[model samples]
Target: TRLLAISPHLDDAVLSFGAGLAQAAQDGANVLVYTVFAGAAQPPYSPAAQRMHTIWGLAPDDDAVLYRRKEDIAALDHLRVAHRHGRFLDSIYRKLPDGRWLTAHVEGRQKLAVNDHSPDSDHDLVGEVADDIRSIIDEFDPTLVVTCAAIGEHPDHEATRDAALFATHEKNVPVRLWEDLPYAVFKSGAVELPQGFRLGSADVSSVKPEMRSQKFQAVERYSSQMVLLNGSENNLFDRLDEHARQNAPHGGYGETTWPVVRSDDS
Candidate 1:
């Protein structure tokens, strides 16, 4: 069996369902990860390491996005899943003069240049991402697809979900959607899975106990992303344990499903 996860950014997949991924891998499933929003808007030299160094007035000569990917690579290694990074379609709000990503730009005064990939409508990130998903499905042919539910907190999160769903319909494939806890959920518990909202069914009991550690380890690998999750005075272990329990088949936030379905009704 094979599973395909499409993430909007490098750390997204891990943050949402790394535990499930580890369990799948351990169960001898072939897992392929496709990251749709791995690109960054800054110059290549401002990676997390260099960004840290820049705080100390030390600059490095490597690409920031590349460095971030290296960190992601280490995280993915921990999860034992293979991933491929997608190309950047520079954010419409922040494009460079040559129609490429600008290494650096002044905030509030920077202007975006129109390019071929520029959205004709207002902020069509989801539609653009949908096109990418369609292509990946054609290439990968995974039985199960996992992605965000666009839980209404982040625009990109919603966009990723919308795009993935659009692509699934286009490909005529059965895909099970999963929800990731949003940043807001961590702090105020504001974002909850809506009532009567069912995406699909999953085999929650199949998940192993040790899966949490593998996922936590993967999250720790994204040193940059962790910064956002930290300083909340939150206990990682406690939070994960609670998260796992809540998300388990009997009570977790996601809807489980039969991994793959040949017919639409299946």
Candidate 2:
């Protein structure tokens, strides 16, 4: 079977669903990861974005996007999956017509701020992204396409999720929306499906000892991101363990997904 996993950022797919993806590859399925927003950032970043880069330990002249792309390639290689990267810029680097950043933070969480843009404009942007995804779907013809839930908490995540759903709908393919992890785990309450969507199925895949080890190692490839994601505590594994325990009822050492189905479905 062919499986396509859509990621908003370089490390997201591996961070959220490494065990299942690696297991699929090991089980002889053709697995591919397509990462959107993997392109380089333009200079003259917003102060917030510049600060974020400093926090990420990138020097002023460093090619951060290229470096992250390399990290993603290494991580996917470890998972034994083929990968591709789209050319869209990450939300941090995006700007409004007047040169203000398109996203901002609220209590340390990112939010979209596309003020003054008409609904048609937003639809056009999403439609263009969906077209790119549709081309990939046509080429790969995957049996399953997995992507983030359209929860709207993170701008990039929401954009990628919308694009994936749009593409799948246009192509008439099966899709599974994975909860945006760490966010899903750390957020205050349970995540709900988008309006007109319902829980289709829930399943957990047990990660064998070797697979768990490989998952951790693959995550380690994203060292720069880990520093920011784990912060001073540096408890990446601890958080993963906590989540695993929560999912233990489903019989997994790690990994669980409750896929959403459209209400219109049979």
Candidate 3:
């Protein structure tokens, strides 16, 4: 089967669903990972951006996005998954209508507040993202689509999930929602799909030992994200492995996903 995995960030697809992608590739299925918000931003970054740059081991004015993108390419290549990057600037680099930055350093994390007037000022970013995802879906025409479940409520993650849902629902293609890892380790919450859609039963994908190891190797490719992920906990790789085992029915390393089903009542 042709599989399309939509990632909100550079490392998400590999971080959360690397084993599944690799397993599918080994099974002779074509897999492509499309990352939204992988765009580059000019200098004059906000305070939050600079702090993130420092945390990611980059100079304040360095091309952090470019470096992260390169890391993503390597990670995806290792998984045998095709890579596609979108041009939407991440929230850290965006500004509100009043010239305030869209993100903030809240509680030691780069958090983005809900854009209450997002439609008015952000020019329907969700819609724009949906359109771009739709174009990709048309070009790829994959049998299956996947994206983050947005359990942690990260704005970018939520946007990518919504866009993937809209695009896949419109195209009448089946979609699966990967549980967001690292974020999953810290937070426990359910994901909310857009109206007219509901989640199906959990689908557990257990990978072989070697495949799981390969997934971890791919996760380490995101050097810039190391500090950010390990900020609240130590041994990010261990955390990821633990999270996978937690979700696996066999108590082995694996990932869980939920199918996005259309609700007739809605």
Best by lDDT: 3
lDDT (0-100) at residue 117 of candidate 3? 47
Predicted candidate 2 versus true structure: per-residue lDDT over 1-266, tens digit per residue: 99999999988898888888999999999999999989777677765666667777787546778888999999999999999999888877876666666765445655334435456755666677799899999999999999876343676787788778778876888888776666766665244544565667767667887888888899999877888778588897788878887878655467767665678753
Over 4 Å off, model 2: 104-118, 150-152, 188-196, 249-252
The residue pairs found clashing in candidate 3 are none
Model 3 CA lDDT for position 172 = 90
Better of 1 and 3 by lDDT: 3
Whole-model alpha-carbon lDDT for candidate 1: 0.61
lDDT of 3 by residue, 137-232 (tens): 899999999999998888889989998898888889999999898788878758777889899999887678989988988988999987787766
Give residue 55's error in model 3 in angstroms: 0.5
- TM-score result, candidate 1: 0.69
For each of the candidates, the C-alpha root-mean-square deviation to the true structure, in angstroms, is: 6.7, 2.8, 2.1
Quote model 3's TM-score: 0.93
lDDT of each candidate versus the true structure = 0.61, 0.78, 0.86
